[PDB]
């Protein structure tokens with residue numbers, strides 16, 4: 802589990818979005834595994850605006866943050882998980898690392914701020930849904 806809180810937005814994995822998220826929907830994209838809902842309180846997070854390929858991510862199934870190198874966001878085939886069938890996921894970054902389903906929502910961060918959240922795992926990789934292209938998160 803986990804979210805990003807920027808301005809009056811809450812960014813979660815689409816597959817972990819609650820009824821309250823869907824009832825306060827701003828934007829959602831199944832192909833990216835992202836959903837954004839509206840918040841009452843202002844968020845603590847700063848979104849990275851950059852093309853870094855190194856950062857640190859939180860792994861809840863290890864209670865640990867790991868430094869990783871990761872691929873640039875791309876359209877990638879993802880094998881079936883407990884929460885999606887096998888499918889193509891867009892805006893996905895991969896790194897070598899540990900990820901189980903419940904690790905979804907862990908933050909990946911670089912020197913510029915939050916890059917994305919854990920979205921995929923298995924076969925010794927961790928996949929992250931990028932948010933650095935969602936410029937509208939930073940205003941309004």
Ligand SMILES: CS(=O)(=O)N1CCC(O)CC1
Nearest residue numbers: 881882883884885886887
């Ligand atoms: C219905 S779901 O959550 O998308 N998911 C489909 C693939 C299966 O491996 C687990 C269940």
Ligand SMILES: [Zn+2]
Nearest residue numbers: 851853911913
């Ligand atoms: Zn960066």
